[PDB]
Amino acid sequence: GVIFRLIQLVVLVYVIGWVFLYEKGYQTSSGLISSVSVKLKGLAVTQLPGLGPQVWDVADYVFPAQGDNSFVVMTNFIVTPKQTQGYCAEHPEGGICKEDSGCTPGKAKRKAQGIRTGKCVAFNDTVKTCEIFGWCPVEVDDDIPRPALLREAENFTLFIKNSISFPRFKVNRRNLHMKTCLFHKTLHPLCPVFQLGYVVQESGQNFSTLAEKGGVVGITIDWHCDLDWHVRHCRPIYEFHGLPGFNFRFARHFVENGTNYRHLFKVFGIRFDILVDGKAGKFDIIPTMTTIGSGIGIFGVATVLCDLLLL
Amino acid sequence: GVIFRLIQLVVLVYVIGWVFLYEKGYQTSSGLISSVSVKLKGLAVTQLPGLGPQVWDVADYVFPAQGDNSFVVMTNFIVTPKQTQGYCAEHPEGGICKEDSGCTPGKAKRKAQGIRTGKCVAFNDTVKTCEIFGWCPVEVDDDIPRPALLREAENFTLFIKNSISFPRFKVNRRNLHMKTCLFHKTLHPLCPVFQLGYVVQESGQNFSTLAEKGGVVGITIDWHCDLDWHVRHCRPIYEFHGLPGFNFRFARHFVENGTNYRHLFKVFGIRFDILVDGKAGKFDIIPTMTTIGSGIGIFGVATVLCDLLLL
Amino acid sequence: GVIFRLIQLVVLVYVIGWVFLYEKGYQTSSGLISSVSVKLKGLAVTQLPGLGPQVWDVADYVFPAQGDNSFVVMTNFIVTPKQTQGYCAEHPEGGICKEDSGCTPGKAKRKAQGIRTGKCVAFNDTVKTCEIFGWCPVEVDDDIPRPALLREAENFTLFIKNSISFPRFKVNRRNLHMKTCLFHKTLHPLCPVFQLGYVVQESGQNFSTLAEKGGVVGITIDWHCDLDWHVRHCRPIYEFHGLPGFNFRFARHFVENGTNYRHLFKVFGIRFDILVDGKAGKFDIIPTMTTIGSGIGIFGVATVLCDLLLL
Ligand SMILES: CC(C)CCC[C@@H](C)[C@H]1CC[C@H]2[C@@H]3CC=C4C[C@@H](OC(=O)CCC(=O)O)CC[C@]4(C)[C@H]3CC[C@]12C
Ligand SMILES: CC(C)CCC[C@@H](C)[C@H]1CC[C@H]2[C@@H]3CC=C4C[C@@H](OC(=O)CCC(=O)O)CC[C@]4(C)[C@H]3CC[C@]12C
Ligand SMILES: CC(C)CCC[C@@H](C)[C@H]1CC[C@H]2[C@@H]3CC=C4C[C@@H](OC(=O)CCC(=O)O)CC[C@]4(C)[C@H]3CC[C@]12C
Ligand SMILES: CC(C)CCC[C@@H](C)[C@H]1CC[C@H]2[C@@H]3CC=C4C[C@@H](OC(=O)CCC(=O)O)CC[C@]4(C)[C@H]3CC[C@]12C
Ligand SMILES: CC(C)CCC[C@@H](C)[C@H]1CC[C@H]2[C@@H]3CC=C4C[C@@H](OC(=O)CCC(=O)O)CC[C@]4(C)[C@H]3CC[C@]12C
Ligand SMILES: CC(C)CCC[C@@H](C)[C@H]1CC[C@H]2[C@@H]3CC=C4C[C@@H](OC(=O)CCC(=O)O)CC[C@]4(C)[C@H]3CC[C@]12C
Ligand SMILES: *[C@@H]1O[C@H](CO)[C@@H](O[C@@H]2O[C@H](CO)[C@@H](O)[C@H](O)[C@H]2NC(C)=O)[C@H](O)[C@H]1NC(C)=O
Ligand SMILES: *[C@@H]1O[C@H](CO)[C@@H](O[C@@H]2O[C@H](CO)[C@@H](O)[C@H](O)[C@H]2NC(C)=O)[C@H](O)[C@H]1NC(C)=O
Ligand SMILES: *[C@@H]1O[C@H](CO)[C@@H](O[C@@H]2O[C@H](CO)[C@@H](O)[C@H](O)[C@H]2NC(C)=O)[C@H](O)[C@H]1NC(C)=O
Ligand SMILES: *[C@@H]1O[C@H](CO)[C@@H](O)[C@H](O)[C@H]1NC(C)=O
Ligand SMILES: *[C@@H]1O[C@H](CO)[C@@H](O)[C@H](O)[C@H]1NC(C)=O
Ligand SMILES: *[C@@H]1O[C@H](CO)[C@@H](O)[C@H](O)[C@H]1NC(C)=O
Ligand SMILES: *[C@@H]1O[C@H](CO)[C@@H](O)[C@H](O)[C@H]1NC(C)=O
Ligand SMILES: *[C@@H]1O[C@H](CO)[C@@H](O)[C@H](O)[C@H]1NC(C)=O
Ligand SMILES: *[C@@H]1O[C@H](CO)[C@@H](O)[C@H](O)[C@H]1NC(C)=O
Ligand SMILES: *[C@@H]1O[C@H](CO)[C@@H](O)[C@H](O)[C@H]1NC(C)=O
Ligand SMILES: *[C@@H]1O[C@H](CO)[C@@H](O)[C@H](O)[C@H]1NC(C)=O
Ligand SMILES: *[C@@H]1O[C@H](CO)[C@@H](O)[C@H](O)[C@H]1NC(C)=O
Q1: Contact in structure between B293 and C294 (CB atoms under 8 Å)
Q2: In a shared domain, residues B36 and B21
């Protein structure tokens, strides 16, 4: 008879501890719908690489300007100035040629830089490359600037505004001294102002390296909230992680004397992805009663098996 | 014996009414994957503030132009024209100085506007401020235009196209007289063309105030759909809510006589976030059978307790 | 007695096969949080329509340049060159007028193109239209170019980088010869480089038609992963589907001799939406024990009913 008492004990212990108190089996879970607003702050100066000092404001190093959940902060770039649409020699990458016979008119099949012509022109004092129609002069992105141009982006600040809501429960929570306040994993774990160097350091990456050629940093805001407790306990955890380099080409188009030109930029930047996930639970009677009924059922399959086995 | 009959009654009532008929405990829930397309319509004119009439088209007051789930409609702005990169006095905010001793060469630690120099120059006929290298002339954003410049944005129309799908069930639903049709919470509750003034009014905010200095308006499309009923009943509910002001700085870069300038804009706008959440349920046999088994289990723990207590 | 044995059989078969082995009722499900990076590749040339050859690079035909989950690839456009803000005749759409009496000063109520004036001016050698203040000359978008200008966009390549994570289980999965590798539904079903023509073909749409006037193509990455098996089996399925045309107006602003102009573009493009959904299950003891208890419960309601009915 003691064995049956022990069986009833293990099941009660399982049902109360594991099902209810440990895993919150008495609760009903809901996700959230969230909105994120990011505001960058800081100035950058590129003294030597800019041929005289050059200043980069928020209107310049943040893509997009209006902001988004995923945004890029430029940390380095190569600029091809005054590119016009006309005839020019292509990068030796397109292929080095030493006669007009090699050149084949028409667009190339791989790494096309324009429309080739049956002509060979000098790329510089040594290499002769196939003439093309396209944006000229052609870009040279081989030499990535090192050290990075916007290496002061590590001291920029990132202010994140997050407004979530658990629609099933009608609970709405925002994530906001704090003006002159900076986030530290432990010392200041609830201050929504982040420094980019610190964010990159917490993702496990080196800002010097992830600057000189770009990268991706994913920021996660975790709202794990037990709505049985007061909503004042519903607080966010900021989790930093890295999701080769990140680069993109953008072009500033301008007109001079009736002709359309453009400044081509190859932007090596850090793409920030603010991911917001959360689980809110609150007591419900249906899961509670379901767990107790299934538990009485396990008592039966256990007691009967023990008795039948004993018999 | 009557007590046992009553206990069997309460449980049947609970299981049938609350578990099944009220909370749809016989069903299996699925979320959705959605796509939103927004198309703005309207023109704005800024007669007096623009130094002669000025017209703002969709290509201008919507950020981004291509559209997105979250977009900004400019309602007011401050423009700093022909900013070049050169030497100039900084905003008195950087700090008022009355000699060259105060000026400290190098970028400042807080609110840096450029690269200071050991020189003091006149900001105007009274204040003398530290000379800086940066975009000049410097911006003055203290005087926010009131009334708003694009106060006609309240009469712009917002056409939202939403295409959802409940992938688990393979059900795809779109949210579309209606051309000349406008949405009213009650009179016209299914017309996807919204007027910005009405959307802001339904979020609880005043458009005059949320125009002069910006704001955030969140639009939610709720697809709560019972797939036991015909898909023609699967319809969206449009829920408007507000998620200080919203502002961003963008720059139009142009070239004049070989020199790079820019028009700096401080945009006070209303950011619209189209959030689309939904729950689709359809009958499943597993939850139904689970609910009945747990219910037979509760009958046991109830009948036994009553009998044992009576004994 | 045989009937009771058969009843115990049907329930065991149901519980083991349908509840556990078929529907994975012994498991616990988790969604995912994902990040998508898209990189376009290709060049386009518009020989005849461009009044001499015209070249379109990635910096030009992709909106936004930095990339996003939802992006637009321009396939056709109408350009209104050198639009200045001044006085001009409006499109005959605004309304044809044959005197000054018809013209009514002030902005129109529908399809407003500017600020009308009590004057009538000639649109061309035949129609006389109401004079307006606005961006002039006015746009004429009636004639959509056919064949499309960027009809070579079908041979552009779309490289998608997807990094998901199932946060509940702490499992992180990315979706990556493959450099010169192209995706085919069956032959190459795991190569993340897609060709736009093929993507559009797999959505059921014709690229010639969805080019000449735009469209929407939705790309879904499905991560259905059984974490009982090794993570090497957790792989993505690429599902292509179409979510009238898609068009947007963007403006390149430039300055000439102190005057602000703009190039107005009406972009007919294909909007790509990368939707990433997934379900990860892993064995849990709570659902397993819940299913067995409810099953013992069904045995009871079945055996008792059979006996009572027999009696
Ligand atoms: C084990 C089987 C046979 C069922 C018998 C036990 C359950 C009825 C117990 C176990 C765990 C209990 C839960 C543990 C914690 C809480 C949080 C508690 O939170 C509050 O509301 C307290 C603060 C406040 O009063 O605001 C409310 C009760 C609840 C849901 C308890 C409800 C009763 C539960 C489900
Ligand atoms: C063990 C047998 C007799 C079955 C009963 C199960 C118990 C383990 C349950 C029954 C009542 C439960 C308690 C009911 C209410 C609360 C208050 C609850 O308080 C909060 O968390 C609220 C805090 C806040 O409001 O911020 C903490 C759990 C506790 C002690 C529960 C712990 C688990 C208890 C003791
Ligand atoms: C209470 C315990 C002991 C179980 C006994 C009752 C259940 C078997 C009942 C209660 C609620 C019923 C559900 C209530 C509503 C509907 C919607 C109904 O929808 C239709 O398909 C009707 C329209 C059509 O025919 O297309 C289908 C049956 C269903 C799922 C019912 C299935 C049978 C359920 C689960
Ligand atoms: C009460 C005891 C005897 C146990 C049986 C539970 C009942 C409460 C269940 C059994 C059958 C159910 C019915 C089965 C089917 C339908 C049709 C269903 O119709 C729809 O919703 C379909 C409408 C559409 O197709 O658009 C509405 C619920 C109803 C009446 C159900 C209501 C609940 C009922 C009566
Ligand atoms: C039918 C009722 C009375 C319960 C009795 C049967 C269950 C205990 C069985 C049925 C289906 C079984 C599952 C079927 C498949 C798997 C995958 C299997 O995956 C592995 O881990 C195998 C590979 C490895 O060793 O890494 C682990 C056991 C599990 C979860 C099984 C656990 C035991 C289950 C739940
Ligand atoms: C039928 C009665 C006696 C109740 C027991 C239920 C059975 C149907 C269960 C019990 C053990 C289960 C097995 C336990 C473990 C595995 C290994 C599992 O292997 C994998 O999927 C792992 C592969 C990998 O690691 O990549 C496949 C299911 C299987 C055979 C299960 C199939 C279903 C079984 C036989
Ligand atoms: C002319 O251009 C070619 C091509 O850029 C130069 O050759 C490159 O030189 C660098 C530096 O040594 C190498 O890293 C590259 O591998 C070379 N490219 C090729 C295709 O050989 C060449 O040096 C240039 N000539 C001058 C005088 O500047
Ligand atoms: C010169 O510039 C300074 C700084 O903008 C002006 O001082 C400001 O005046 C306004 C209007 O009274 C006040 O609201 C600000 O608080 C003042 N700022 C500071 C730092 O004192 C000053 O008025 C300007 N002088 C002239 C003649 O225009
Ligand atoms: C002057 O402009 C009007 C308006 O665009 C032209 O009339 C259009 O002509 C086309 C071609 O036949 C028709 O498809 C449109 O329906 C006409 N519009 C209207 C409002 O009638 C007219 O042809 C132009 N005149 C010249 C000489 O070019
Ligand atoms: C950021 O500020 C610290 C403060 O000491 C400075 O040492 C560092 O050089 C700054 N980062 C730059 C300049 O990139
Ligand atoms: C990595 O970061 C450290 C500072 O944390 C820096 O000193 C080092 O130079 C970085 N790595 C490289 C290769 O420079
Ligand atoms: C501007 O273009 C015209 C037309 O080609 C040319 O005659 C003129 O010399 C150009 N002016 C300058 C300053 O390049
Ligand atoms: C919007 O239209 C109404 C129509 O009467 C007008 O009164 C109102 O002034 C308009 N909103 C503006 C001009 O901002
Ligand atoms: C609030 O809105 C009303 C119209 O609904 C307007 O009359 C009022 O002026 C607004 N508030 C303020 C402070 O102007
Ligand atoms: C254009 O720049 C050159 C070089 O500084 C200068 O000589 C010339 O006067 C400038 N022209 C005008 C119109 O400013
Ligand atoms: C894409 O490449 C194929 C290769 O044969 C070519 O036939 C086709 O014309 C190309 N698509 C264009 C040019 O739009
Ligand atoms: C549809 O696509 C086919 C090629 O798959 C093409 O030949 C045909 O012209 C397209 N439809 C139309 C109306 O052109
Ligand atoms: C530039 O604008 C000024 C001021 O209107 C005018 O006097 C001058 O002729 C213009 N120059 C050209 C080349 O249009």
Answers
A1: yes
A2: no
Write down the residue that tokens 């349920």 correspond to.
B281
Q: Please, which chains are in contact with C (at least 3 CB pairs closer than 8 A)?
A: A, B
Of the candidates B53, B263, B293, the beta carbon closest to that of C115 is on B53
In whole angstroms, how far apart are CA A11 and each of A21, A284, B306, C30, C217?
Answer: 14, 22, 22, 27, 53
Contact yes or no for B206/B196 (Cβ under 8 A): no
Give the amino acid at A291. Answer: T
* Cβ–Cβ below 8 Å for C59 and A246: no
In a domain? residue A106: no
Are the CB atoms for C11 and A192 separated by under 8 Å?
A: no
- Work out how many domains chain A is built from and give that number: 2
Range of the domain at B55: 30-77+150-254+268-283
Q: For residues A97 and A130, is the Cβ–Cβ distance under 8 A?
A: yes
> Which of C174, C39, C69, C231 minimizes the C-alpha distance to A242?
C174
How was this one solved?
cryo-EM
C20, C55: one domain: no
The enclosing domain of B22 has a CATH number of: 1.10.287.940
- Which residue on chain B is closest to C296 by alpha carbon? B293
Is there a domain that residue C59 lies in? Answer: yes
Report DSSP state, residue A180. T
Nearest CA in chain B to C278: B167
Burial class (CB in 10 A: 0-12, 13-18, 19+), A153: buried
DSSP string of A86-150, one letter each residue: EEEEPPGGG-B-SSTTT--SEE-SSS--SEEEEEEEESSSS-EEEEEEEEESPP--SS--SS-TT
Does C128 carry a binding-site annotation? no
Assess A302–C contact: CB distance below 8 Å, yes or no.
no
**Ligand 10 pocket residue status of A173, Cβ below 6 Å:** no
How far does the centroid of ligand 5 lie from the alpha carbon of residue A31, in Å?
A: 29
Resolution at which this structure was determined, Å: 2.7
Q: Cβ–Cβ of C107/B68 closer than 8 Å?
A: no
Q: Which helix (H) or strand (E) holds C252?
A: strand C247-256
Q: Is C258's Cβ below 8 Å from some Cβ in A?
A: no
Task: Tell me, yes or no, whether A71 and A198 share the same domain.
Answer: yes
User: B240: domain CATH number?
Assistant: 2.60.490.10
Place of tokens 């299914």: B190
Residues B168, B59 share a domain = yes
Nearest ligand 3 atom to the CA of C301 is 3
Tell me the chain A residues in contact with residue B220 when contact means C-beta distances shorter than 8 Å: 33, 167
In a domain? residue C272: yes
Breaks in chain B after residues (C–N exceeding 2.5 Å): 176, 243
What is the residue with the minimal CA distance to atom 1 of ligand 15?
B257
Q: Which residues pair with A220 in a beta bridge?
A: A239, A275
**Rounded to an integer, what distance in angstroms lies between the CA atom of residue C41 and that of residue B286?**
49
| Contact call for residues B160 and B36 (beta carbons, < 8 A) | yes
User: Is B106 inside a domain boundary?
Assistant: no
**Residue whose CA lies nearest to ligand 12 atom number 13:** A257
C249 marked among binding-site residues: yes
A242 lines ligand 7 (CB under 6 A): no
The pick from B9, B14, B18, B21 for probing ligand 4's pocket by mutation, whose C-beta has the most ligand atoms within 8 angstroms, reads B21
